[PDB]
Each structure stands twice: as C-alpha cells, then as structure tokens.
C-alpha cells in the first residue's frame, strides 16, 4: 500500500542526454569523461530494466523536443519515466550545445495535467551539472 | 484530484549555488557514485536509500585535485528533491 505499483509490462523509458561538445558561441569547453558517465549510466539503467536511449550533443530545441515527445508517448504499460541530463549548467538552467534552457521547462511536460499516462507514477530526473560558482571548502 | 507537481524526483549532483566536479579520466563524481550504488543495490533498496548512500559516497570518497589552489581539495554533496508519494523499488 506504501510502494509505487510496479506490475507493468515495461519498467519505463530512460532518456540520457549526453552533452560533451559545445558551440564556440557559448564559450563552454569539452566535458571530458562524460562518455564514461553515459556508458556507465547506460548499463546501469538498462540493468534496472529501463528502455534506454542516449542522445549526444543536443541543442536546446532538441532537448525540449525530445522531452516533449517522450511526454506525448503512451506510458499505460510503463511503471515510471527517467531522464538523465549530463551537461554544463547554472542554477535552474542547463546547457544545450547552443545555449541555456531552464530545467523546469524540460520537466514541466511531465506534469500530471500534461501527461495522463504517467499520472501517479514516478518521474525521475538525474542532473549532472553545476548550479552556481560557490566552492565547498570542506571541514575535517 | 491530484497535484500536477506530484510524483517527481530530482537527483541533483550538487546543492543550489555550487560547483559539480568531474574527473576527465573517470567521469563525474556524482555519476561514478550513482553507478557504484546501482550495480550493488539497484534492485533491493528503495530509491531514497540508494540516493542517500550516493550522497555519503560523494561526500566522503571524493576530493578535487587541481593546479590552481583556489580549487585544491574541494568537496561536494549532492542534493535530492523528492515530491514522491510512495516508496520506489526497481522490481
């Protein structure tokens, strides 16, 4: 009574957006190691049971369209949805290869009123990206 | 009725306002730790248990190495935002 129902045909869809190379006009450098991340996440989320697809060096419009379309698919036979964002970023905002786009705009497509077939089902967002420029100096 | 914002979970690599660290030869700290925990326990722990162990692993196992001393030996804690209404197991 206290768990999400998992008795569906599919675990669900998992979208990995792996942004390594950025346009000169953005000024952002290459994210070395992010391919190692994406392949490790691919194996893990596949092992969990997600139908995983990786999309590389996406533009802001492609990220928005990828997530808008996924939101419009039929998830009746899916238990949940996951999306993983690997990119440069700043607070509330993530880099496409051609600029910044707000994270809330990527996720709002999955709101209860905009995606009925995921209603009452977990929608999960894993976000590797900066949220500002403060350093945690740590303490012993 | 049911809130339109319910049943989201955001697993951020870092806290609001802060850097997120990445090793060029091994990958980002958060993802290294997340994959570690998922290989061992993805199927028998609840999502908040998995992500709490990830928090601990990023907080303890990683320390930045850098030429610039402004960025020498810095630390990171990830940040989980849960609007979940039930426990979540992947099985």
């Amino acid at each position: 009574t206290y768990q999400y129902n998992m008795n569906f045909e599919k675990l669900g869809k998992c979208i990995i957006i792996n942004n390594k190379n950025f346009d000169k006009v953005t000024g952002m450098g290459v994210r070395n190691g992010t391919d190692k991340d994406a392949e490790a996440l691919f194996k893990c989320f596949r092992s969990l049971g997600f139908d995983v697809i990786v999309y590389n060096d996406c533009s802001c419009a492609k990220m928005q369209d990828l997530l808008k379309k996924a939101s419009e698919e039929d998830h009746t036979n899916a238990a949940c949805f996951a999306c993983i964002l690997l990119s440069h970023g700043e607070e509330n905002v993530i880099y496409g290869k051609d600029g910044v786009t707000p994270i809330k705009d990527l996720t709002a497509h999955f709101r209860g009123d905009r995606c009925k077939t995921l209603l009452e089902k977990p929608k999960l967002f894993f976000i590797q990206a900066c949220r500002g420029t403060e350093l945690d100096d740590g303490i012993q | 009725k049911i809130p339109v914002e319910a049943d989201f979970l955001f697993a951020y690599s870092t806290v609001p306002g802060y850097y997120s660290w990445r090793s060029p030869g091994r990958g980002s700290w958060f993802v290294q730790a997340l994959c570690s925990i998922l290989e061992e326990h993805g199927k028998d722990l609840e999502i908040m248990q998995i992500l709490t162990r990830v928090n601990d692993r990023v907080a303890r196992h990683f320390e930045s190495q850098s030429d610039d001393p402004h960025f020498h030996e810095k630390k990171q804690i990830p940040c989980v935002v849960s609007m979940l209404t039930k426990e979540l197991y992947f099985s």
Binding site: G89, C130 | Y19, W21, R22, P24, S28, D67
Partner: peptide, 5 residues
Amino acid sequence: XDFFX
C-alpha cells in the same frame, strides 16, 4: 585533473 560543469 578535475573540472567543473
């Protein structure tokens, strides 16, 4: 040599 995002 670590980097940030």
